[PDB]
Enzyme design. Structure first.
Site, mmCIF file in Angstrom:
data_model
loop_
_atom_site.group_PDB
_atom_site.id
_atom_site.type_symbol
_atom_site.label_atom_id
_atom_site.label_comp_id
_atom_site.label_asym_id
_atom_site.label_seq_id
_atom_site.Cartn_x
_atom_site.Cartn_y
_atom_site.Cartn_z
ATOM 1 C CG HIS A 69 48.127 -9.949 10.663
ATOM 2 N ND1 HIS A 69 49.293 -10.576 11.078
ATOM 3 C CD2 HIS A 69 47.503 -10.780 9.800
ATOM 4 C CE1 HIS A 69 49.352 -11.779 10.492
ATOM 5 N NE2 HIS A 69 48.254 -11.938 9.722
ATOM 6 C CD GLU A 109 37.467 -27.104 17.067
ATOM 7 O OE1 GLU A 109 37.490 -28.293 16.652
ATOM 8 O OE2 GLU A 109 36.494 -26.323 16.979
ATOM 9 C CG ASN A 139 37.147 -31.959 10.931
ATOM 10 O OD1 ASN A 139 36.619 -30.864 10.689
ATOM 11 N ND2 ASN A 139 37.169 -32.949 10.059
ATOM 12 C CB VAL A 166 33.702 -32.881 12.661
ATOM 13 C CG1 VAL A 166 32.952 -34.061 13.286
ATOM 14 C CG2 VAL A 166 33.607 -32.983 11.144
ATOM 15 C CD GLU A 190 35.253 -30.380 19.483
ATOM 16 O OE1 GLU A 190 34.626 -31.011 20.344
ATOM 17 O OE2 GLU A 190 35.399 -30.810 18.292
ATOM 18 C CG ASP A 245 51.462 -9.192 13.332
ATOM 19 O OD1 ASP A 245 50.402 -8.881 13.892
ATOM 20 O OD2 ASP A 245 51.527 -9.937 12.325
ATOM 21 C CG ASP A 252 56.346 -20.324 4.124
ATOM 22 O OD1 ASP A 252 56.463 -20.030 5.330
ATOM 23 O OD2 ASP A 252 56.211 -19.455 3.212
ATOM 24 C CB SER A 253 53.249 -20.783 8.189
ATOM 25 O OG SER A 253 54.088 -19.623 8.200
ATOM 26 C CD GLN A 310 48.138 -16.447 1.745
ATOM 27 O OE1 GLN A 310 47.774 -17.328 0.951
ATOM 28 N NE2 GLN A 310 49.319 -15.845 1.649
ATOM 29 N N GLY A 311 45.982 -18.013 6.852
ATOM 30 C CA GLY A 311 45.078 -18.768 7.698
ATOM 31 C C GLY A 311 45.799 -19.466 8.838
ATOM 32 C CB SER A 330 47.799 -15.132 10.248
ATOM 33 O OG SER A 330 48.477 -14.870 9.039
ATOM 34 N N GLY A 331 48.887 -15.927 13.327
ATOM 35 C CA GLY A 331 48.567 -15.838 14.758
ATOM 36 C C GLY A 331 48.979 -17.087 15.544
#
Ligand SMILES: [Ca+2]
Length: 223
Positions: free
Chosen positions: A40, A52, A54, A57, A62, A84, A171-172, A174-175, A177-178
């Site tokens: 999704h 990563e 932050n 920044v 990275e 999914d 909980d986990s 929105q954002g 996800s994955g």
């Protein structure tokens, strides 16, 4: 992540951010050239960001690598979120070290009661909206299939498990996800869905990765 803790820089070295001008999904590095995420989370133009903490920044650890190809699971159903799961191949291999590292695939499925680590840059509130810049972490147990199905009648397939707390509060969201659910050093889950975040009797629902190891391994070997 609602109700979690600041992980600490690069303490979750397999965690990736998927970026299309902005962070939009998590992922997991499973070898130097492949990432696993939720179907999704599919879009065109993905840059993978490794190392990563932050996400706003540049801190020095990275690696930013374009995706060459995305593969959504052949049986993904966007109505039910069954299957999914998606693979992303990087244009070139990442350099692996203490701070950027892959996570092992499971050789067997985890059971209810196992404690797992869930991580991401998603929303930190259950009512309202606040996105963190640094990675957040949550320790949560896998719940029984029976409590999972009781929470979400007629919605849980054999490719899904619940993890979290029936009392709410952690909980986990929105954002996230994955992103990864790791248990005893193995990737057992992908952050997939849930009704709201951190609501009572509404735990998180995760893609059951152990069902897909054959597909992942054959797909990588051929692509
Ligand atoms: Ca950064």
């Amino acid at each position: 992540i609602v109700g979690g803790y600041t992980c600490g820089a690069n303490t979750v070295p397999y965690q990736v951010s998927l970026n299309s001008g902005y962070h939009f999904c998590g992922g997991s590095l499973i070898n130097s050239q492949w990432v696993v995420s939720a179907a999704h989370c599919y879009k065109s133009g993905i840059q993978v960001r490794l190392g990563e903490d932050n996400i706003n920044v540049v801190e020095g650890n990275e690696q930013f690598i374009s995706a060459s190809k995305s593969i959504v699971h052949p049986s993904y159903n966007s109505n039910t979120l069954n299957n999914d799961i998606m693979l992303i191949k990087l244009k070139s291999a990442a350099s692996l070290n203490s701070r950027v590292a892959s996570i092992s695939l499971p050789t067997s499925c985890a059971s209810a009661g196992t404690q797992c680590l869930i991580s991401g840059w998603g929303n930190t509130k259950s009512s309202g909206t606040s996105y963190p810049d640094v990675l957040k972490c949550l320790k949560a147990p896998i719940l029984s299939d029976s409590s999972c199905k009781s929470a979400y009648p007629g919605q849980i397939t054999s490719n899904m498990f619940c993890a979290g707390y029936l009392e709410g509060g952690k909980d986990s969201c929105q954002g996230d996800s994955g992103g990864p659910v790791v248990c005893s050093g193995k990737l057992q889950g992908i952050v997939s869905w849930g009704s709201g975040c951190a609501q009572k009797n509404k735990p998180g629902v995760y893609t059951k990765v152990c069902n897909y190891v054959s597909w992942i391994k054959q797909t990588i070997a051929s692509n």
